[PDB]
Amino acid sequence: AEEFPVPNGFESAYREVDGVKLHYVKGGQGPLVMLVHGFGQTWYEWHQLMPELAKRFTVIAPDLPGLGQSEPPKTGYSGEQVAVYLHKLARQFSPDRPFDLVAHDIGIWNTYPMVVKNQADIARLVYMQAPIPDARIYRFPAFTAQGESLVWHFSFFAADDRLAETLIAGKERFFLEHFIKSHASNTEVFSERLLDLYARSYAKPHSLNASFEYYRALNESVRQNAELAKTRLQMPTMTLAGGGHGGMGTFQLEQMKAYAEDVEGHVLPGCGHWLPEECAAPMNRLVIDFLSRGRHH
Amino acid sequence: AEEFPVPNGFESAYREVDGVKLHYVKGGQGPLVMLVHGFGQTWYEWHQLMPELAKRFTVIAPDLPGLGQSEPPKTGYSGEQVAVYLHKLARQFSPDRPFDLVAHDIGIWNTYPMVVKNQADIARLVYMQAPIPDARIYRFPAFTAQGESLVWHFSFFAADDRLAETLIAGKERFFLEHFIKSHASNTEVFSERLLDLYARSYAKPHSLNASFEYYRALNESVRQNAELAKTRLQMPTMTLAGGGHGGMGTFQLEQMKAYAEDVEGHVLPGCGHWLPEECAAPMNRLVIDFLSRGRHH
Numbered sequence: 001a002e003e004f005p006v007p008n009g010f011e012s013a014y015r016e017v018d019g020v021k022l023h024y025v026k027g028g029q030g031p032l033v034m035l036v037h038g039f040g041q042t043w044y045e046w047h048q049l050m051p052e053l054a055k056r057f058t059v060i061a062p063d064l065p066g067l068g069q070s071e072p073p074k075t076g077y078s079g080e081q082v083a084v085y086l087h088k089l090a091r092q093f094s095p096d097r098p099f100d101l102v103a104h105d106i107g108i109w110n111t112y113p114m115v116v117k118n119q120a121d122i123a124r125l126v127y128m129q130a131p132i133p134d135a136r137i138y139r140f141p142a143f144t145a146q147g148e149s150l151v152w153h154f155s156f157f158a159a160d161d162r163l164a165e166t167l168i169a170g171k172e173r174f175f176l177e178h179f180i181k182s183h184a185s186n187t188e189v190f191s192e193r194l195l196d197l198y199a200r201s202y203a204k205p206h207s208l209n210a211s212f213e214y215y216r217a218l219n220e221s222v223r224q225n226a227e228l229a230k231t232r233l234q235m236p237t238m239t240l241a242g243g244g245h246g247g248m249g250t251f252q253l254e255q256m257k258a259y260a261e262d263v264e265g266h267v268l269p270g271c272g273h274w275l276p277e278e279c280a281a282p283m284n285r286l287v288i289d290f291l292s293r294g295r296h297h
Numbered sequence: 298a299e300e301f302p303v304p305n306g307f308e309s310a311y312r313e314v315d316g317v318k319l320h321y322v323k324g325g326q327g328p329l330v331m332l333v334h335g336f337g338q339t340w341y342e343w344h345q346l347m348p349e350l351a352k353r354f355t356v357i358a359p360d361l362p363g364l365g366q367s368e369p370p371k372t373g374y375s376g377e378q379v380a381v382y383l384h385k386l387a388r389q390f391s392p393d394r395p396f397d398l399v400a401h402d403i404g405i406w407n408t409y410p411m412v413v414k415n416q417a418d419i420a421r422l423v424y425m426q427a428p429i430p431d432a433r434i435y436r437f438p439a440f441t442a443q444g445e446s447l448v449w450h451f452s453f454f455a456a457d458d459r460l461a462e463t464l465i466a467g468k469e470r471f472f473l474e475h476f477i478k479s480h481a482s483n484t485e486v487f488s489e490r491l492l493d494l495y496a497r498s499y500a501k502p503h504s505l506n507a508s509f510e511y512y513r514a515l516n517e518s519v520r521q522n523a524e525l526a527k528t529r530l531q532m533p534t535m536t537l538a539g540g541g542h543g544g545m546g547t548f549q550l551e552q553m554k555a556y557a558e559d560v561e562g563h564v565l566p567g568c569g570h571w572l573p574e575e576c577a578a579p580m581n582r583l584v585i586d587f588l589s590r591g592r593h594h
């Protein structure tokens with residue numbers, strides 16, 4: 001069974017990594033690019049970008065542990081723990097050469113530690129729409145002069161007593177539509193049909209729980225990154241952020257400048273959080289061009 | 298019929314104010330003191346203080362519009378709109394003398410405008426455990442290095458699509474227990490019976506909605522208060538806040554200093570948000586002593 005339709009010429013497959021069965025979709029030829037999705041979604045957020053990248057790269061898009069069709073992690077959900085799975089997965093397909101990385105939302109949290117600990121393995125890096133977990137997140141406001149802030153879900157999802165699963169179970173499709181659209185500028189790309197696909201996936205009980213365990217580990221990830229950040233990233237990096245409702249605006253680049261020696265950033269107007277879907281044409285162009293500066297098929 | 302047991306010597310009654318039938322519990326003799334409850338609760342949070350105050354004052358404890366047994370407002374839920382109902386209710390019982398006011402949590406939001414606009418009507422003022430709505434609330438953090446913050450409910454409750462009603466319906470007792478205990482230092486004061494009573498009251502569909510409409514009007518209340526705050530409060534004021542988990546600490550008095558010329562403050566160590574229940578005896582003492590400096594029975 002497949003939760004989302006595989007683009008023509010791609011394969012849906014699984015690979016056991018440290019006892020955890022990870023789902024991924026792979027296609028193309030050439031140097032490897034790994035694309036890592038975020039909360040509320042799966043590999044499928046990349047499905048429009050993947051055929052274009054596969055003209056020049058081998059493309060792999062895994063489901064994060066516990067999400068999509070991937071088994072939950074056996075170690076834990078902190079960034080350093082999850083990054084081991086993703087690093088080992090990528091290195092199975094690119095054992096002798098560095099690979100490229102594109103990551104969205106908590107995909108950043110789940111890859112930053114393996115990037116900084118294995119810098120020679122990462123040729124080029126693209127990060128979009130999430131802070132790297134550090135002390136800056138403790139200053140984000142709970143409430144804004146416009147109304148509800150974009151990050152109160154940090155506390156909701158991290159709350160104990162399984163608060164979020166208990167309130168959202170049985171209402172997953174309602175919650176996800178509200179959550180996605182509230183973080184979007186171009187909301188009407190989120191058709192009922194597309195929302196149905198995403199909601200059915202994260203409504204699996206272990207996936208609903210996995211979704212929130214990433215946030216229950218957020219403070220641990222901050223503590224991990226306080227040590228890791230003592231070494232700046234040396235590879236070429238690009239940040240993308242939405243400029244519209246739901247977008248991180250200038251924060252994405254400004255934080256990354258503290259982490260990376262070589263970074264360029266873009267803010268996409270009229271685009272919110274969900275860049276691959278809200279603003280596919282400019283986002284895909286920016287990613288393809290940036291990765292194509294390095295060698296490719 | 299009664300949602301909560303009435304203390305001996307008190308009467309549960311109703312008055313129509315601007316076409317809205319307000320419920321209150323009243324007893325005692327002497328100058329009037331009005332006690333105004335906050336979110337998650339009703340007049341009943343005052344039921345231990347009421348008989349002690351009734352020895353020297355006429356005591357009235359209304360249910361906020363839409364909560365407990367009070368009808369929803371017919372104008373709206375902003376602080377200025379709700380304060381009209383509370384002011385006119387108090388004036389029905391104290392038309393010829395200024396009256397005292399004690400307010401907790403959103404009881405502050407719903408009384409501050411009528412205090413600043415009718416200062417000659419307010420003899421003494423006691424405010425506990427809530428910010429007056431102003432720009433300071435936009436600095437409260439969404440997330441903390443210890444887990445969920447105390448203020449992310451501002452955004453949860455203000456969100457549209459009836460997000461809070463939809464997620465909490467069928468789980469009203471579960472949510473309220475979690476919410477109360479996460480804002481408490483002393484959780485043992487919240488018995489099964491007490492939580493049952495509060496949960497059944499705010500679970501009434503119109504009361505569940507009313508609870509969150511106060512937050513959907515919060516930014517409007519902020520904007521209203523920006524104009525009202527040009528006039529400082531001149532009457533004797535006391536602030537109270539918890540010093541334990543859930544408490545506002547020094548914020549309560551420090552904010553009130555910008556609003557009131559004559560203010561004294563206390564922080565109660567070992568107490569959280571729910572001061573009348575978590576720390577009934579010292580809270581009662583400080584309120585009674587502060588109000589008894591003025592002319593009473």
Ligand SMILES: *[C@H](CC)[C@H](O)C/C=C\C/C=C\C/C=C\C/C=C\C/C=C\CCC(=O)O
Binds near residue numbers: 130140150183246
């Ligand atoms: C996934 C979310 C679905 C992760 O949990 C969180 C990742 C991103 C959160 C989405 C948006 C965050 C929005 C802004 C927070 C940072 C500040 C923005 C800086 C300047 C923009 C100006 C402004 O609008 O205030």
Ligand SMILES: *[C@H](CC)[C@H](O)C/C=C\C/C=C\C/C=C\C/C=C\C/C=C\CCC(=O)O
Binds near residue numbers: 428
């Ligand atoms: C009713 C809540 C049930 C109202 O919606 C909110 C009123 C207050 C909630 C309780 C506390 C949070 C309020 C504002 C936070 C302000 C400052 C907190 C700073 C430190 C004091 C103690 C601490 O948290 O360490």
